[PDB]
Amino acid sequence: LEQMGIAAKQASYKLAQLSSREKNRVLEKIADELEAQSEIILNANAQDVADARANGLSEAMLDRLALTPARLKGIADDVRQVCNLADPVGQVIDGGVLDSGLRLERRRVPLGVIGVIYEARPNVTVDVASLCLKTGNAVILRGGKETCRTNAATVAVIQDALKSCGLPAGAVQAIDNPDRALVSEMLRMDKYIDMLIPRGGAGLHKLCREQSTIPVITGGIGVCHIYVDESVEIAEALKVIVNAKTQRPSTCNTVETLLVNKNIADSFLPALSKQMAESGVTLHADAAALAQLQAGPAKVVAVKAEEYDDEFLSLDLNVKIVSDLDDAIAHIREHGTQHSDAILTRDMRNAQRFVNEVDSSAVYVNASTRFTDGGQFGLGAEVAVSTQKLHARGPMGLEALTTYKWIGIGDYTIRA
Amino acid sequence: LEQMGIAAKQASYKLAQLSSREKNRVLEKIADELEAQSEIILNANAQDVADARANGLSEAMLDRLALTPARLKGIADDVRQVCNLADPVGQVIDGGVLDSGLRLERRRVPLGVIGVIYEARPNVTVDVASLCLKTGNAVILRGGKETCRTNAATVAVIQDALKSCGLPAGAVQAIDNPDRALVSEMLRMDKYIDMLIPRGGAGLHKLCREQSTIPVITGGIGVCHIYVDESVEIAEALKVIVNAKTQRPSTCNTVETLLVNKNIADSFLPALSKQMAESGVTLHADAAALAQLQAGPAKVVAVKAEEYDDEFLSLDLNVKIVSDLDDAIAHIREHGTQHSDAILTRDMRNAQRFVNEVDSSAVYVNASTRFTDGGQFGLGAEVAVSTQKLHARGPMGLEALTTYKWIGIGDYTIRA
Ligand SMILES: NC(=O)c1ccc[n+]([C@@H]2O[C@H](COP(=O)([O-])OP(=O)(O)OC[C@H]3O[C@@H](n4cnc5c(N)ncnc54)[C@H](OP(=O)(O)O)[C@@H]3O)[C@@H](O)[C@H]2O)c1
Numbered sequence: 006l007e008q009m010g011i012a013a014k015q016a017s018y019k020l021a022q023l024s025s026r027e028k029n030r031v032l033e034k035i036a037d038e039l040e041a042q043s044e045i046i047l048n049a050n051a052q053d054v055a056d057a058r059a060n061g062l063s064e065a066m067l068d069r070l071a072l073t074p075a076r077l078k079g080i081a082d083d084v085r086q087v088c089n090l091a092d093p094v095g096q097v098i099d100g101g102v103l104d105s106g107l108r109l110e111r112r113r114v115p116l117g118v119i120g121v122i123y124e125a126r127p128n129v130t131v132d133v134a135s136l137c138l139k140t141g142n143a144v145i146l147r148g149g150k151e152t153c154r155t156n157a158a159t160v161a162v163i164q165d166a167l168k169s170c171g172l173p174a175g176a177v178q179a180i181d182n183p184d185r186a187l188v189s190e191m192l193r194m195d196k197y198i199d200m201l202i203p204r205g206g207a208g209l210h211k212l213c214r215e216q217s218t219i220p221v222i223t224g225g226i227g228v229c230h231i232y233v234d235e236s237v238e239i240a241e242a243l244k245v246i247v248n249a250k251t252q253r254p255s256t257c258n259t260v261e262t263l264l265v266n267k268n269i270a271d272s273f274l275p276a277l278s279k280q281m282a283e284s285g286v287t288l289h290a291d292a293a294a295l296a297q298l299q300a301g302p303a304k305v306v307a308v309k310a311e312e313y314d315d316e317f318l319s320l321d322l323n324v325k326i327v328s329d330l331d332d333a334i335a336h337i338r339e340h341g342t343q344h345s346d347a348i349l350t351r352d353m354r355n356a357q358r359f360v361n362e363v364d365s366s367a368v369y370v371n372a373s374t375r376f377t378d379g380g381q382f383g384l385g386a387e388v389a390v391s392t393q394k395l396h397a398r399g400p401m402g403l404e405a406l407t408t409y410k411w412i413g414i415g416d417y418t419i420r421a
Numbered sequence: 422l423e424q425m426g427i428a429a430k431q432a433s434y435k436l437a438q439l440s441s442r443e444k445n446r447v448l449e450k451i452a453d454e455l456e457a458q459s460e461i462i463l464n465a466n467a468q469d470v471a472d473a474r475a476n477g478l479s480e481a482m483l484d485r486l487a488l489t490p491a492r493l494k495g496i497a498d499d500v501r502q503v504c505n506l507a508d509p510v511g512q513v514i515d516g517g518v519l520d521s522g523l524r525l526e527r528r529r530v531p532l533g534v535i536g537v538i539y540e541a542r543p544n545v546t547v548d549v550a551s552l553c554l555k556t557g558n559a560v561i562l563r564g565g566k567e568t569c570r571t572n573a574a575t576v577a578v579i580q581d582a583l584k585s586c587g588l589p590a591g592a593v594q595a596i597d598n599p600d601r602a603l604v605s606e607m608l609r610m611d612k613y614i615d616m617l618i619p620r621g622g623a624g625l626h627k628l629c630r631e632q633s634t635i636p637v638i639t640g641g642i643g644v645c646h647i648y649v650d651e652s653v654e655i656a657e658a659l660k661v662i663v664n665a666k667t668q669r670p671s672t673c674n675t676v677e678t679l680l681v682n683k684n685i686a687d688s689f690l691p692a693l694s695k696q697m698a699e700s701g702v703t704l705h706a707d708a709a710a711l712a713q714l715q716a717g718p719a720k721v722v723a724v725k726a727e728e729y730d731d732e733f734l735s736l737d738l739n740v741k742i743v744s745d746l747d748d749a750i751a752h753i754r755e756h757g758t759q760h761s762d763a764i765l766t767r768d769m770r771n772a773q774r775f776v777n778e779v780d781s782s783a784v785y786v787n788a789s790t791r792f793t794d795g796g797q798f799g800l801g802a803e804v805a806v807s808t809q810k811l812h813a814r815g816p817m818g819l820e821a822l823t824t825y826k827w828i829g830i831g832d833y834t835i836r837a
């Protein structure tokens with residue numbers, strides 16, 4: 006794969022030296038070509054979905070795999086939105102004049118070569134390629150073993166567009182082979198890749214962090230908690246919970262654990278049990294909440310200790326009764342994965358304390374956890390939702406793929 | 422060492438929850454106590470310098486280790502200057518109102534627990550402790566074997582101040598044993614320290630990147646190049662080079678390789694030889710410049726292939742004659758460590774090309790490479806100069822020790 010690395014570096018130099026007009030032109034060509042070849046991509050994705058259904062995959066997994074024409078138009082519109090955004094290369098962050106007469110400033114520059122290891126989702130290839138082209142980085146992709154044909158067709162379209170627009174061919178490339186030995190080799194390829202973005206579960210992150218030399222921005226799994234305070238509207242809270250759970254339960258920002266204040270559980274729990282039975286969501290309750298949730302129509306089973314630290318990725322929910330805000334904060338800190346946290350309350354003090362004392366990539370007050378998305382947050386699209394602390398955090402947009410450089414212009418200045 | 426980490430985390434929570442007034446009070450008390458107890462620090466540093474010189478340490482190394490009363494007053498003034506800076510915690514980076522009615526914003530927050538492994542330099546301890554206190558981080562320091570008594574006294578003073586002002590004693594900790602097994606043990610504590618700052622030569626960074634599981638911001642070694650164009654003022658270039666080389670040659674932002682355009686080399690080289698000899702600097706010339714530099718009084722020796730990639734850390738310079746700007750850029754890319762580069766020229770186009778095409782943490786036009794400092798760049802003080810690309814680059818100020826967090830407020834908002 007060393008030839009891939011050298012090609013990526015050679016293309017990255019020229020990309021960093023490009024102008025905004027050429028990048029916008031290539032993005033427009035990519036979007037137009039995506040719209041033109043809808044039939045091929047749709048047929049390949051349908052065939053792949055039919056193949057995956059033979060293995061008895063989960064309904065949520067199939068929904069993630071599925072690609073309707075509406076979704077294709079959505080990804081095309083996202084590419085166009087990225088095109089309409091301002092180019093973040095060359096922008097001045099700040100500047101000034103020092104005491105010695107030196108004119109100093111900070112200017113944004115690209116990062117170099119970016120490696121991406123993503124899950125089985127079709128659109129992610131498009132978004133990553135568009136963001137990397139707009140910013141000025143060469144990208145090496147390694148997708149999941151399921152979406153082989155869809156990723157093949159999409160990367161073929163992207164590379165055809167790159168060739169037609171005159172950009173170097175090594176700007177964007179992908180690894181077709183699904184063997185994980187090549188994944189290890191990519192991880193060891195330190196002299197070429199400048200930064201690696203793994204998206205996936207615990208196993209991929211474990212293996213990567215074990216055997217990585219490149220800087221890593223871990224996508225991380227998401228255990229998102231929702232805290233229900235004593236003073237809250239029942240109907241609105243139920244609507245928010247239903248939206249945060251039912252809609253697309255296969256994502257990573259879907260709520261997984263529900264923390265209910267003990268002074269409200271006498272009234273909130275029964276209604277919830279009525280609502281979940283409508284959506285068919287199984288309730289993994291604690292011992293304290295089991296007695297109240299037993300009479301509810303919705304099916305309820307006792308929870309286990311290890312279930313608090315993993316994602317259900319289905320129509321399941323953890324119900325726990327806490328004593329006060331301090332207990333909820335302690336539980337979130339202990340079991341949370343620092344992805345997204347929400348509080349439903351009517352107290353200004355409680356909302357302020359929750360916002361202050363909870364460390365996460367995103368904290369919401371009277372809102373659903375499903376807002377942790379690149380498109381929703383105002384950015385054109387996202388490459389991954391970083392849960393670490395270094396470099397970017399939360400959704401990673403155009404500015405998350407760029408670094409900065411100090412430039413100082415003087416007149417034969419000498420440091421005193 | 423685990424108890425050290427537990428104390429660090431427990432102190433980090435409370436420190437992140439503090440206010441600006443308390444941190445400023447602690448810093449002012451620290452500076453006052455440093456000025457009050459100058460005698461003990463001076464005695465310890467003098468004894469350490471005597472012991473080091475008894476081992477035949479280099480003159481530049483001894484100058485780095487030496488701490489005069491003027492230097493002590495300077496570090497006290499820098500601590501006070503930091504105390505006078507604005508607290509970066511809580512600042513709003515940006516924000517807005519989204520389409521769905523959700524008010525989004527970004528707020529700065531402390532990183533957490535910070536581990537520092539640094540060279541033998543007395544002032545770095547105080548600077549790191551002050552910055553970590555001001556930001557709201559807990560710090561674990563592990564200094565060089567030389568600075569033992571000085572670091573012991575300074576850490577005693579800081580711990581006493583923290584105890585007196587009521588802050589938890591676990592905020593600032595240091596390791597006294599110079600064994601490197603403890604260094605490895607600190608390296609292996611991933612879940613407890615949040616970010617590591619190693620300062621040192623290639624050996625320390627190699628060992629850290631070999632067996633580290635914590636995010637690392639490498640200080641890195643510094644090979645700083647200066648390119649002399651065809652048309653330039655001889656006297657001004659000479660004085661800038663003299664300032665960049667002679668003054669404090671033991672630092673890391675000192676010029677090592679001098680690139681001279683062949684068109685000007687017929688006249689620039691002799692004058693340089695007349696000046697450099699007055700400074701007593703040996704010239705490790707290349708083959709092309711060997712004939713011209715021989716007549717000059719300055720000492721000249723043939724350069725070796727490996728000398729281009731290592732710092733002299735003394736009064737030594739590398740003279741290489743290049744063809745044009747493209748050759749200089751290629752050489753800088755090949756051999757540079759991406760620390761600080763400068764160009765002395767009278768052409769606007771050449772300056773623009775050099776600024777655009779050279780990838781370094783700092784690029785200067787008609788200036789010196791000695792400006793790559795935390796204090797010079799307007800920041801109060803720096804913990805290290807980062808030569809990597811992730812997180813901060815160049816000097817690391819107050820904001821380099823803080824990350825950000827998304828906050829979203831809504832009225833039971835639902836994602837559409
Ligand atoms: N944090 C974020 O921004 C974000 C975004 C999207 C998804 N996610 C997470 O994605 C997870 C589900 O992803 P998934 O359904 O695709 O399953 P997964 O097992 O998490 O996917 C792992 C990814 O890496 C590969 N992989 C798996 N095991 C590997 C190993 N041992 N060595 C090398 N590569 C390996 C997989 O392809 P192969 O199996 O073919 O090797 C796949 O591309 C959820 O937990 C969710 O939280 C997070």
Ligand SMILES: NC(=O)c1ccc[n+]([C@@H]2O[C@H](COP(=O)([O-])OP(=O)(O)OC[C@H]3O[C@@H](n4cnc5c(N)ncnc54)[C@H](OP(=O)(O)O)[C@@H]3O)[C@@H](O)[C@H]2O)c1
Nearest residue numbers: 539540541565566601621622625640641642643673805806
């Ligand atoms: N990039 C920057 O911002 C920056 C700033 C300052 C200095 N520097 C660099 O500092 C260098 C000189 O530093 P120096 O004179 O102190 O020498 P050094 O050998 O670079 O110092 C290494 C530092 O780490 C320790 N260390 C050395 N070998 C180690 C090992 N195998 N395992 C663990 N710890 C180890 C040393 O103390 P022990 O030997 O007792 O272990 C010392 O604290 C220059 O090359 C300069 O460029 C860079």
